Enzyme design. Structure first.
Site, PDB file in Angstrom:
ATOM      1  N   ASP A 286      14.315 -21.006 -32.329  1.00 50.24           N
ATOM      2  CA  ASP A 286      14.333 -20.271 -33.601  1.00 50.24           C
ATOM      3  C   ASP A 286      15.501 -19.323 -33.515  1.00 50.24           C
ATOM      4  O   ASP A 286      15.954 -18.971 -32.403  1.00 50.24           O
ATOM      5  CB  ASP A 286      12.996 -19.653 -34.008  1.00 50.24           C
ATOM      6  CG  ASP A 286      12.340 -18.753 -33.024  1.00 50.24           C
ATOM      7  OD1 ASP A 286      13.012 -18.184 -32.140  1.00 50.24           O
ATOM      8  OD2 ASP A 286      11.098 -18.623 -33.102  1.00 50.24           O
TER       9      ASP A 286
ATOM     10  N   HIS B 269      14.801 -18.747 -28.148  1.00 48.15           N
ATOM     11  CA  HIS B 269      14.562 -17.746 -29.172  1.00 48.15           C
ATOM     12  C   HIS B 269      15.814 -16.909 -29.305  1.00 48.15           C
ATOM     13  O   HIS B 269      16.040 -15.960 -28.505  1.00 48.15           O
ATOM     14  CB  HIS B 269      13.396 -16.890 -28.779  1.00 48.15           C
ATOM     15  CG  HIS B 269      12.114 -17.658 -28.748  1.00 48.15           C
ATOM     16  ND1 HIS B 269      11.574 -18.213 -29.870  1.00 48.15           N
ATOM     17  CD2 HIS B 269      11.247 -17.960 -27.759  1.00 48.15           C
ATOM     18  CE1 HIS B 269      10.467 -18.853 -29.573  1.00 48.15           C
ATOM     19  NE2 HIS B 269      10.264 -18.729 -28.280  1.00 48.15           N
TER      20      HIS B 269
ATOM     21  N   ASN C 188       9.217 -23.492 -17.966  1.00 43.15           N
ATOM     22  CA  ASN C 188       9.688 -23.023 -19.329  1.00 43.15           C
ATOM     23  C   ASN C 188       9.948 -21.545 -19.308  1.00 43.15           C
ATOM     24  O   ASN C 188       9.197 -20.790 -18.728  1.00 43.15           O
ATOM     25  CB  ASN C 188       8.611 -23.412 -20.336  1.00 43.15           C
ATOM     26  CG  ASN C 188       9.009 -23.300 -21.797  1.00 43.15           C
ATOM     27  OD1 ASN C 188       9.974 -23.945 -22.206  1.00 43.15           O
ATOM     28  ND2 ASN C 188       8.303 -22.450 -22.565  1.00 43.15           N
TER      29      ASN C 188
ATOM     30  N   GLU D 137      11.500 -24.058 -27.936  1.00 40.92           N
ATOM     31  CA  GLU D 137      10.872 -23.123 -28.873  1.00 40.92           C
ATOM     32  C   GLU D 137      11.970 -22.540 -29.784  1.00 40.92           C
ATOM     33  O   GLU D 137      11.920 -21.344 -30.124  1.00 40.92           O
ATOM     34  CB  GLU D 137      10.142 -21.999 -28.133  1.00 40.92           C
ATOM     35  CG  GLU D 137       9.185 -22.445 -27.036  1.00 40.92           C
ATOM     36  CD  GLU D 137       8.425 -21.387 -26.418  1.00 40.92           C
ATOM     37  OE1 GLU D 137       8.441 -20.210 -26.826  1.00 40.92           O
ATOM     38  OE2 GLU D 137       7.674 -21.714 -25.411  1.00 40.92           O
TER      39      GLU D 137
ATOM     40  N   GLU E 257       7.590 -18.409 -18.100  1.00 37.90           N
ATOM     41  CA  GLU E 257       8.073 -17.030 -18.054  1.00 37.90           C
ATOM     42  C   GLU E 257       7.795 -16.361 -16.718  1.00 37.90           C
ATOM     43  O   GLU E 257       7.237 -15.218 -16.681  1.00 37.90           O
ATOM     44  CB  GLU E 257       7.501 -16.244 -19.232  1.00 37.90           C
ATOM     45  CG  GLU E 257       7.909 -16.816 -20.580  1.00 37.90           C
ATOM     46  CD  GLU E 257       7.420 -16.032 -21.767  1.00 37.90           C
ATOM     47  OE1 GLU E 257       6.734 -15.000 -21.593  1.00 37.90           O
ATOM     48  OE2 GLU E 257       7.718 -16.500 -22.896  1.00 37.90           O
TER      49      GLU E 257
HETATM   50  O1  LIG Z   1       6.865 -12.605 -25.084  1.00 38.61           O
HETATM   51  C1  LIG Z   1       8.130 -13.267 -25.040  1.00 38.61           C
HETATM   52  C2  LIG Z   1       9.186 -12.379 -25.673  1.00 38.61           C
HETATM   53  O2  LIG Z   1       9.392 -11.183 -24.923  1.00 38.61           O
HETATM   54  C3  LIG Z   1      10.514 -13.098 -25.723  1.00 38.61           C
HETATM   55  O3  LIG Z   1      11.430 -12.031 -26.148  1.00 38.61           O
HETATM   56  C4  LIG Z   1      12.786 -12.304 -25.937  1.00 38.61           C
HETATM   57  C5  LIG Z   1      13.426 -11.007 -25.436  1.00 38.61           C
HETATM   58  O4  LIG Z   1      14.792 -11.299 -25.086  1.00 38.61           O
HETATM   59  C6  LIG Z   1      15.241 -11.920 -26.317  1.00 38.61           C
HETATM   60  O5  LIG Z   1      15.972 -11.174 -27.271  1.00 38.61           O
HETATM   61  C7  LIG Z   1      14.775 -13.287 -26.671  1.00 38.61           C
HETATM   62  O6  LIG Z   1      15.604 -13.579 -27.760  1.00 38.61           O
HETATM   63  C8  LIG Z   1      13.405 -12.979 -27.159  1.00 38.61           C
HETATM   64  O7  LIG Z   1      12.632 -14.101 -27.439  1.00 38.61           O
HETATM   65  O8  LIG Z   1      10.337 -14.324 -26.367  1.00 38.61           O
HETATM   66  C9  LIG Z   1       9.382 -15.275 -25.874  1.00 38.61           C
HETATM   67  C10 LIG Z   1       8.006 -14.586 -25.809  1.00 38.61           C
HETATM   68  O9  LIG Z   1       6.955 -15.451 -25.333  1.00 38.61           O
END
Ligand SMILES: O[C@@H]1[C@@H](O)[C@H](O[C@@H]2CO[C@H](O)[C@H](O)[C@H]2O)OC[C@H]1O
Ligand code: NAG
Length: 319
Positions: A240, A208, A172, A238, A131
């Site tokens: 989902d 996600h 990642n 990851e 990230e």
């Molecule tokens: O902390 C992060 C989350 O912020 C991340 O959130 C995202 C935001 O943009 C999205 O809608 C995506 O679908 C979400 O997952 O997800 C990973 C996590 O470690």
């Protein structure tokens, strides 16, 4: 027979799942986690992060990480190891420190060396940096970026490679699965690491996603190929697909097609080595605690029964 046998029949290395240590006391859960028809690979959801593994500086702590490895080993499952450098789940000593570039670099490199050496030979892949991007493709203003600048990223890679030259080194991130500034910036990270002279083997696509708002198979595939073109492998790490609650038959059916396109996009891209879902049962999903009003994100429900998404995955895998 299941997700992992289907994935492997199409040339993927695995289908897998994350887990976390508190779940390993639940025998019914563990029985299905350990079903290698469905899962050929495991990721620790929390026990290899920096707070877990280096709670005080130079004081490492591996019991919880090792317990997940030991379960994968018992089952003959691969591991993905997650994650060495990340702005979240840092211990206080990192987040509160008065750092210079030299002192933070030393701490970061020592974290990497110790954790990677500890797990040498045990991991298929490491998520070395997690990230590092903002949504617009600029660098996330973490402590590492503020103090060290962009070089933190290739330095982290190079340090991991020195410690374990065999394990696949991944970058990642989330929101790098669809076309846009962030995915372009992720391609640029790959390029930057190689321009420094450091090793990067893979791009990890968190995946996600949201039911009814998932990237299409076509765009997912263009994006995967945009990374494989650079001479790296890719994986969904990851996966989902969270739904706006309440759950309904129609939402469950949409969720199935949404999952189906992810699996199929991977199969369609040579160099996509696998899919990991972020746990496998709705009971244990991280989603409801973070995304208020969302849930039911996974291919089994909270009672450990398959949802339509299981079948969507199987269909996308051509099984
Ligand atoms: O902390 C992060 C989350 O912020 C991340 O959130 C995202 C935001 O943009 C999205 O809608 C995506 O679908 C979400 O997952 O997800 C990973 C996590 O470690
Ligand atoms: C930190 O140090 C390394 C040299 O070891 C360097 O690549 C980088 O530019 C430095 N960053 C800052 C912000 O001074």
């Amino acid at each position: 027979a299941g997700l992992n046998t289907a994935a492997k029949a199409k040339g993927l290395k695995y289908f897998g799942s994350a887990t976390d240590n508190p779940e390993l006391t639940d025998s019914a859960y563990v029985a299905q986690l350990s079903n290698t028809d469905d899962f050929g690979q495991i990721t620790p959801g929390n026990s290899m992060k920096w707070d877990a593994t280096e709670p005080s500086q130079n004081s490492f702590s591996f019991a919880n990480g090792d317990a997940v490895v030991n379960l994968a080993n018992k089952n003959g499952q691969l591991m993905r190891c997650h994650t060495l450098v990340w702005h979240s789940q840092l211990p206080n000593w990192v987040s509160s420190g008065s750092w210079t570039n030299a002192t933070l670099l030393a701490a970061m490199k020592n974290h990497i060396t110790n954790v990677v050496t500890h797990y040498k030979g045990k991991c298929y892949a490491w998520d070395v940096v997690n990230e590092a991007l903002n949504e617009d493709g600029t660098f996330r203003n973490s402590v590492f970026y503020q103090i060290i600048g962009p070089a933190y990223i290739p330095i982290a890679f190079a340090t991991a490679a020195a410690a374990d030259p065999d394990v696949k080194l991944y970058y990642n991130d989330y929101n790098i699965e669809y076309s846009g500034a962030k995915a372009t910036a992720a391609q640029n990270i790959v390029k930057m690491i190689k321009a420094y002279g450091a090793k990067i083997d893979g791009v990890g696509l968190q995946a996600h996603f949201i039911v009814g708002s998932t990237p299409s198979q076509s765009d997912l595939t263009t994006v995967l190929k945009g990374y494989t073109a650079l001479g790296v492998e890719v994986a969904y790490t990851e996966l989902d697909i969270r739904m706006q609650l309440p759950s309904t038959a129609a939402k469950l059916a949409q969720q199935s097609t949404d999952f189906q396109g992810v699996a199929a996009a991977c199969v369609s891209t040579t160099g996509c080595v696998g899919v990991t879902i972020w746990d496998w049962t709705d009971k244990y999903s991280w989603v409801p605690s973070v995304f208020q009003g969302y849930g039911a994100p996974l291919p089994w429900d909270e009672n450990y029964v398959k949802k339509p998404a299981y079948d969507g995955l199987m269909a996308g895998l051509g099984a």
